[PDB]
Design an enzyme around this catalytic site. Structure first.
Site, PDB file in Angstrom:
ATOM      1  N   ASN A 235      28.533  47.950  -2.792  1.00  0.00           N
ATOM      2  CA  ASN A 235      27.707  47.505  -1.657  1.00  0.00           C
ATOM      3  C   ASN A 235      28.315  46.405  -0.964  1.00  0.00           C
ATOM      4  O   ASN A 235      29.533  46.225  -0.890  1.00  0.00           O
ATOM      5  CB  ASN A 235      26.728  46.950  -2.463  1.00  0.00           C
ATOM      6  CG  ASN A 235      26.833  45.681  -3.321  1.00  0.00           C
ATOM      7  OD1 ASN A 235      28.090  45.716  -4.012  1.00  0.00           O
ATOM      8  ND2 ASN A 235      26.224  44.707  -3.215  1.00  0.00           N
TER       9      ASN A 235
ATOM     10  N   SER B  52      15.679  37.242  -4.134  1.00  0.00           N
ATOM     11  CA  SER B  52      14.829  36.971  -3.192  1.00  0.00           C
ATOM     12  C   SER B  52      13.990  38.341  -2.712  1.00  0.00           C
ATOM     13  O   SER B  52      12.707  38.124  -2.551  1.00  0.00           O
ATOM     14  CB  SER B  52      15.392  36.726  -1.821  1.00  0.00           C
ATOM     15  OG  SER B  52      16.109  35.490  -2.213  1.00  0.00           O
TER      16      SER B  52
ATOM     17  N   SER C 136      17.636  44.856  -3.586  1.00  0.00           N
ATOM     18  CA  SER C 136      18.458  44.118  -3.041  1.00  0.00           C
ATOM     19  C   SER C 136      19.727  44.698  -2.348  1.00  0.00           C
ATOM     20  O   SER C 136      19.982  44.237  -1.230  1.00  0.00           O
ATOM     21  CB  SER C 136      18.875  42.778  -3.719  1.00  0.00           C
ATOM     22  OG  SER C 136      18.154  42.515  -5.140  1.00  0.00           O
TER      23      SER C 136
ATOM     24  N   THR D 286      24.203  35.022  -5.831  1.00  0.00           N
ATOM     25  CA  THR D 286      23.181  34.220  -5.885  1.00  0.00           C
ATOM     26  C   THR D 286      22.897  33.248  -4.792  1.00  0.00           C
ATOM     27  O   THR D 286      22.528  31.860  -4.962  1.00  0.00           O
ATOM     28  CB  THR D 286      23.058  33.346  -7.343  1.00  0.00           C
ATOM     29  OG1 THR D 286      24.162  32.328  -7.348  1.00  0.00           O
ATOM     30  CG2 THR D 286      23.075  34.288  -8.539  1.00  0.00           C
ATOM     31  N   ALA D 287      23.463  33.645  -3.691  1.00  0.00           N
ATOM     32  CA  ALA D 287      23.575  32.805  -2.296  1.00  0.00           C
ATOM     33  C   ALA D 287      22.490  31.735  -2.341  1.00  0.00           C
ATOM     34  O   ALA D 287      22.708  30.594  -1.694  1.00  0.00           O
ATOM     35  CB  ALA D 287      23.643  33.754  -1.324  1.00  0.00           C
TER      36      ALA D 287
ATOM     37  N   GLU E  38      29.620  43.862  -6.002  1.00  0.00           N
ATOM     38  CA  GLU E  38      29.661  43.638  -7.322  1.00  0.00           C
ATOM     39  C   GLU E  38      28.783  44.765  -7.901  1.00  0.00           C
ATOM     40  O   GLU E  38      28.561  44.854  -9.186  1.00  0.00           O
ATOM     41  CB  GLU E  38      28.928  42.479  -7.819  1.00  0.00           C
ATOM     42  CG  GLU E  38      27.371  42.663  -7.628  1.00  0.00           C
ATOM     43  CD  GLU E  38      26.710  42.406  -6.223  1.00  0.00           C
ATOM     44  OE1 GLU E  38      25.597  41.860  -5.851  1.00  0.00           O
ATOM     45  OE2 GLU E  38      27.659  43.099  -5.473  1.00  0.00           O
TER      46      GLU E  38
ATOM     47  N   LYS F  99       0.943  -1.279   0.285  1.00  0.00           N
ATOM     48  CA  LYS F  99       0.019  -0.088  -0.078  1.00  0.00           C
ATOM     49  C   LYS F  99       0.965   1.358  -0.240  1.00  0.00           C
ATOM     50  O   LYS F  99       0.437   2.345  -0.535  1.00  0.00           O
ATOM     51  CB  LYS F  99      -0.812   0.201   1.132  1.00  0.00           C
TER      52      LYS F  99
ATOM     53  N   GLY G  86      34.716  73.508  17.156  1.00  0.00           N
ATOM     54  CA  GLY G  86      33.342  73.830  18.058  1.00  0.00           C
ATOM     55  C   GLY G  86      33.420  73.506  19.451  1.00  0.00           C
ATOM     56  O   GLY G  86      33.222  74.206  20.558  1.00  0.00           O
TER      57      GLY G  86
ATOM     58  N   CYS H 213      27.999  43.104  -1.311  1.00  0.00           N
ATOM     59  CA  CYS H 213      28.570  41.941  -2.102  1.00  0.00           C
ATOM     60  C   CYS H 213      29.747  42.194  -3.016  1.00  0.00           C
ATOM     61  O   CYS H 213      29.936  41.182  -3.457  1.00  0.00           O
ATOM     62  CB  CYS H 213      27.357  41.285  -2.406  1.00  0.00           C
ATOM     63  SG  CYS H 213      26.375  40.557  -0.997  1.00  0.00           S
TER      64      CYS H 213
ATOM     65  N   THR I 239      19.135  31.990  -4.352  1.00  0.00           N
ATOM     66  CA  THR I 239      18.510  31.832  -5.554  1.00  0.00           C
ATOM     67  C   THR I 239      18.673  30.705  -6.155  1.00  0.00           C
ATOM     68  O   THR I 239      17.971  29.898  -6.624  1.00  0.00           O
ATOM     69  CB  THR I 239      18.137  32.959  -6.322  1.00  0.00           C
ATOM     70  OG1 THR I 239      19.707  33.731  -6.001  1.00  0.00           O
ATOM     71  CG2 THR I 239      17.293  33.854  -5.931  1.00  0.00           C
TER      72      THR I 239
END
Ligand SMILES: Cc1cn([C@H]2C[C@H](O)[C@@H](COP(=O)(O)OP(=O)(O)OP(=O)(O)O)O2)c(=O)[nH]c1=O
Ligand SMILES: Cc1cn([C@H]2C[C@H](O)[C@@H](COP(=O)(O)OP(=O)(O)OP(=O)(O)O)O2)c(=O)[nH]c1=O
Ligand SMILES: Nc1nc2c(ncn2[C@@H]2O[C@H](COP(=O)(O)OP(=O)(O)O)[C@@H](O)[C@H]2O)c(=O)[nH]1
Ligand SMILES: Nc1nc2c(ncn2[C@@H]2O[C@H](COP(=O)(O)OP(=O)(O)O)[C@@H](O)[C@H]2O)c(=O)[nH]1
Ligand SMILES: [Mg+2]
Ligand SMILES: [Mg+2]
Lengths: 729, 735
Positions: free
Chosen positions: A414, A189, A204, A591-592, A418, A4, A251, A416, A594
């Site tokens: 940024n 993401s 992102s 693309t950690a 790129e 089954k 100042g 990462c 994805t």
């Protein structure tokens, strides 16, 4: 009794190789624990789990495991898109009684108004194409839940993302859906999470330059980071214009505390505004230029060693490195650290100009501390061999060849490493990202299909472009930057897998050719698409004055002349006439996760291992590299004893006595590939990449000699990002 | 054989030095005028210079203080006339120089004085110069003067360019501007030493963007990171400008609470203070010393109270502490009642139970218990469990500070504005705050010692007369001051509050032959605060009659014919009319929403040489700068009675500063110089209460307990609370 079960499983092996899959065997392991009160959903879950642990035996076991889970997800779910959409919208939160939509009313309405068409465009079959660990990843975070119960099938989400991007343009929406569900490409993401919802924060990454060198200015920038963080954006901050420790405070009458105390405030901000709850603090990359007086302490901020008031360990760190510095290292020389207050505007100018200003400030008295440039150099790589960071980017290389160079000096990258975009006191730069699944284009005939890859690319440019407008910005200046320059970030995944399905070793001449062609077409295709948009909607606000507006494309700045594949002259004839809609286009990102969903290897990266661990809940599973496992079993060479051999070698096929050579070349790990060839292959493709590329250097023999030439190799090759993370033994 | 201050070189004459010291014993206790003891030590070592021999001279004099404290005003005379010898005579010339300053950095012209503020002075060189009495420089003690010079006299590189009087006058005109009549008048009292303005005024009055105020109290804008970080900015800004803060943080939702728009959960009070704590460390005014001061105010119903009390322990996981900050409870009566009747106490999250911090008293209780009926409560503990945690925290860090929400609010003339959500860094200020008002305060303290008669009585009439100048001053500052945040300004110009304190109170008692806690002292205490009130109100009325009332006056307790003592249900003595005063406030009203607030006087009492604020002498032997000091009056009394043998200091140190057992000292002097550790802290409480029936704000009230425990600590808090004090405790000093 047990039949089954078996033939229930069998009904789902409906195409898998049955000389290696044996459903009778999943039953054996399931039998353990007979109906001691085990529900069918419970039992079904036990089965896919059992099935998954048997992947090491053959990859089809993973397809099966997946089928069983998907099968259940379907029996626990509404079969009709429009219906789920409504429920998502109608959600009342039981805890407070407030109606709290899970999709946007306007998205619902575009859906209800197009019920039939959309509803029936779905092929719920496509859910079964995800491999078991991709599915679990989706199910965990990507399919909207109602009351802890997953409400969306994957096809549902996919259709929500499409009609969320394309709003009324059903045709466009239905197009994107097929491309997404047939696994040809995916959005990042942020888009998968929010497309079609309410705060549609679909972006992102964020870049921002520190405002002024004041307490007012610092805190404003902080406030911006917190908000950007609360939007779970990942940031890069250019910190180089802040006074150094000891510098004068006019100042008050005292002395600037330097970068560490200030950076320690940002740190605790990243901890605090961490989406609300748990691990993964906010996540900021702080960018210093190595002329800054505080550089030496800035480098020890991530070290795992006390004086807590002097660490900033939840931050991430990167060097914005000028050319001058590299020269003064390589040709052994003194390096003089100024305070950006004694010496204005050092950050707001690059290359030929930069070198003028520094040498001026220098032989003018206005140094604050002179050191040997090599003493710094080694201090850098002493932290990288230790911590893996700081990331290495070459400021002058990024500015030299960025189509955005008319806006001013690009002050950093940024999180990462790129993305290379301009920031001011009134623009925080942003990026929208998607990736191409390069594996998808190798023909049923072992050739590559550049037409379809260009064709698909053209669509992605459209979508990403719509996003810019649709999207919700966390801060006005982000919205500004973005409408002004309309940049986007097309990226790839499974580039490893492409080669493998071509039978090309990674470092092979043929693979070095494809690597060129593959990124050559993508860039040809994106431009063609952006250029089209420019015909339709006009060129972007800051177009005229830039490199492409002066007739010069990416590879022009690299002096690369491209292959016969595409007719540039003709595309150039188009851009000449209409301009282009998008200031930049291509930015291969990690693309950690994805890639973890689709089934491919991340980004431009080779295979780390040939065995690797995925863990799901309490479950832990050894995954052999699929391609390898087919090649091995589909050749009789695979058994269990061998699995353990390979595992006795961190994952190397190399010493294994009876494995053929064409296969060893093919499936050699990254710890085995010439990293110099890695950088040479990034450089070659980088010519067709208007932003940078997240590039990791894997050395295992972790010594300073081998690394010092690596960076310099990277540098001279003309790369914008020389190094993301240093991964070692 | 020592090169003189002229170049021209005279011989070292053991009679020359000594008679050059005589010239400056022009006012000294005859029988201890021994400059032959002085030059004996000065001429023991010789390694040239006048200025170099003046400083050793002036230090060795300070070191003969514990023989007689006139050696200390002399010790100051030979350092001040040292200073005099090369710091310009005439004042206009000095204020001149400051403006002309051209440092060598950005080697840029950097005026060390206000644009207008010399345009005023030299518009008058004559009158102001022929007002200064540089002999008033000789009326300080050594350690006053050394802290005066350390940081209150304007330095023109190394060389201090201002004389004490010079800095005093600067302030006098930096305040009054055109009104020279009443700028000299201020300068008189200030150099004569009948009071002082607080440091910031002393520091910046008549400079170019005058940071004239010290207190700021704000409340955390809204419960969002948007607003949390707005506040943080505000605090950084205020911090930069020297300002000390109290922040009301109770409205931030608790750890675990739902974040709707991210579908996550707040990390709570702790992670957020950490951002604040680090801010305090970063913006420490520039470089060194001490982190900007932020006192943080929580109400005990807040879910994170137990963590809150852990923040200051200097033992615990790092990301769970916040040591550079300051912690105060804003306690509602309910909580104390619940403790004393041993009932449960419900902890709630301000996001689920809103506006708890928005209301007080009989009303708060309704709303709170309503929240209980609806079972919207996140945790319930026994109130006594919470209590115990509180006083563990005090037992080991002296904090948190104890203010009583309902006493504060019930007794405030700012009531009509809404609920006062917190107090200031030092717990004296009780002022309203809202999304766009941050409360400020400007301080000056009256030198109470200075109002004792030659024939041993109190001059309440001049106490009153001085106080009035003070309020006109502090009020003229509201308009002249420079605020670091728009909201700070707005608040101040609306409600116009003023903070008048005191110093040298223990001294006032002593000078009047009074043991601190005697019936006589207990009454004089009542009566000197009775007058300070009448006084500052008589002036605040006068100001409103001249400049009109203050924006939010109508509807306040005063506009309803109610003064502080009325809100305390205490009857004033026969001393002042009151019937007649209330009548002229009935018509004219008052210019200042709030008048009195005894702040500590940390620095400014050390200056004028008075014992800090409104407390007893804590020891009879202490240490300044190192250099020793036995209490001025005890020595005077001891030596002029013969009891002070050389030996006997070693006795009084041996038993940590107490004269309660030295068999030589008579039963009456034993009474009079009882130290704080020997005085009934409940009596210091009953007194603060008796006094604070006349203080429309609160008074920073340290409590001293040698060897504490749950007993004594609970006992004294509950007592402090019953007597109805707004500040129940500042710091708990043990040891
Ligand atoms: C006030 C303050 C500033 N700083 C640092 C941070 C900034 O890099 C730098 C600038 O402070 P600013 O706030 O710009 O100081 P300022 O108002 O006096 O302006 P300036 O001296 O430029 O004329 O000083 C501290 O480190 N700690 C402090 O307390
Ligand atoms: C976003 C975020 C909020 N919070 C806390 C801080 C405040 O107490 C509270 C403010 O959150 P908000 O900034 O108001 O977040 P929100 O926009 O989702 O608002 P809401 O949930 O109320 O609809 O939540 C965190 O602790 N960490 C975070 O990362
Ligand atoms: N806040 C935050 N952002 C991140 C993090 N990791 C990556 N990002 C952002 O994601 C971008 C790259 O996409 P990628 O890491 O490949 O994620 P994916 O495509 O969605 O799986 C980067 O440029 C960052 O801006 C993180 O840990 N925290
Ligand atoms: N920034 C800062 N302000 C303080 C500090 N201590 C006290 N204050 C402020 O000054 C008031 C108390 O007065 P006090 O300390 O006696 O000041 P002073 O005697 O004039 O120097 C408080 O209400 C605070 O607002 C401190 O350490 N830092
Ligand atoms: Mg500045
Ligand atoms: Mg909110």
């Amino acid at each position: 009794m047990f039949d089954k079960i078996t033939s229930r499983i069998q009904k789902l092996c409906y195409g898998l190789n049955m000389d290696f899959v044996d459903p009778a065997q999943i039953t054996m392991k399931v039998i353990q624990g007979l109906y001691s009160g085990v529900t069918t959903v419970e039992l079904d879950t036990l089965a896919a789990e059992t099935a998954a642990t048997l992947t090491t035996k053959h990859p089809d076991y993973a397809i099966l495991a997946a089928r069983i889970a998907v099968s259940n997800l379907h029996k626990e779910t509404k079969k009709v898109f429009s219906d789920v959409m409504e429920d998502l919208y109608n959600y009342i939160n039981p805890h407070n009684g407030k109606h709290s939509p899970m999709v946007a009313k306007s998205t619902l309405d575009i859906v209800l108004a197009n019920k039939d068409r959309l509803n029936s465009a779905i092929i719920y079959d496509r859910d079964f194409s995800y491999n078991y660990f991709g599915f679990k990843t989706l199910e965990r975070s990507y399919l909207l839940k109602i009351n802890g119960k997953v409400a969306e099938r994957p096809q549902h989400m996919l259709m929500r993302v499409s009609v969320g991007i394309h709003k009324e343009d059903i045709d466009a929406a239905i197009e994107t859906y097929n491309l997404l569900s047939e696994r040809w490409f995916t959005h990042a993401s942020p888009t998968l999470f929010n497309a079609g919802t309410n705060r549609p924060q679909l972006s992102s990454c964020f870049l921002l330059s520190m405002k002024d060198d004041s307490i007012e200015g610092i805190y404003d920038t902080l406030k911006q980071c917190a908000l950007i963080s609360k939007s779970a954006g990942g940031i890069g901050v250019a910190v180089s214009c802040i006074r150094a420790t000891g510098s004068y405070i006019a100042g008050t009458n005292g002395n600037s505390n330097g970068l560490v105390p200030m950076l320690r405030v940002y740190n605790n901000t990243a901890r605090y505004v961490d989406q609300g709850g748990n691990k993964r603090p906010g996540a900021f990359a702080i960018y210093l230029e190595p002329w800054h007086l505080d550089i030496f302490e800035f480098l020890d901020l991530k070290k795992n060693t006390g004086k807590e008031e002097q660490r900033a360990r939840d931050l991430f760190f990167a060097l914005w490195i000028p050319d001058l510095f590299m020269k003064r290292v390589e040709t052994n020389q003194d390096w003089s650290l100024m305070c950006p207050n004694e010496c204005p505007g050092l950050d707001e100018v690059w290359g030929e100009e930069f070198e003028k200003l520094y040498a001026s400030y220098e032989k003018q008295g206005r140094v604050r501390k002179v050191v040997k440039a090599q003493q710094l150099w080694y201090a850098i790589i002493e932290s990288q061999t230790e911590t893996g960071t700081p990331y290495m980017l070459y400021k002058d290389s990024c500015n030299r060849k960025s189509n955005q160079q008319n806006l001013g000096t690009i002050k950093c990258s940024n999180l990462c490493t790129e993305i290379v975009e301009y920031t001011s006191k009134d623009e925080v730069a942003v990026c929208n990202l998607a990736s191409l699944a390069l594996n998808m284009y190798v023909t049923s005939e072992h050739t590559y299909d550049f037409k379809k890859l260009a064709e698909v690319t053209k669509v992605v440019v459209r979508n990403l472009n719509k996003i810019i407008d649709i999207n919700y910005y966390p801060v006005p200046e982000a919205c500004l930057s973005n409408k002004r320059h309309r940049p986007i970030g097309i990226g790839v995944q499974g580039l490893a897998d492409a080669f493998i399905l071509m039978r090309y070793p990674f470092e092979s001449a043929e693979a070095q050719l494809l690597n060129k062609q593959i990124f050559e077409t993508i860039y040809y295709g994106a431009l063609e698409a952006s250029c089209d948009l420019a015909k339709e909607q006009g060129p972007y606000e800051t177009y005229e004055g830039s490199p492409v507006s002066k007739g010069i494309l990416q590879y022009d700045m690299w002096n690369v002349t491209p292959t016969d594949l595409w007719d540039w002259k003709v595309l150039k004839e188009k851009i000449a006439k209409y301009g282009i809609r998008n200031s930049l286009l291509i930015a291969p990102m990690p693309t950690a996760s994805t890639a973890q969903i689709l089934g491919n290897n991340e980004s431009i990266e080779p295979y780390t291992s040939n065995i690797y661990t995925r863990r799901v809940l309490s479950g832990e599973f050894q995954i052999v590299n699929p391609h390898l496992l087919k090649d091995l079993t589909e050749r009789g060479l695979w058994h269990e004893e061998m699995k353990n051999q390979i595992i006795a070698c961190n994952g190397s096929i190399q010493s294994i006595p009876e494995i053929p050579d064409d296969l060893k070349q093919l499936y050699k790990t990254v710890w085995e590939i010439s990293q110099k060839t890695v950088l040479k292959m990034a450089a070659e493709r980088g010519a067709f990449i208007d932003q940078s590329q997240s590039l990791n250097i894997h050395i295992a023999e972790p010594n300073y000699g081998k690394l010092t030439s690596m960076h310099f190799y990277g540098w001279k090759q003309g790369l914008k990002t020389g190094m993301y993370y240093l991964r070692t033994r």
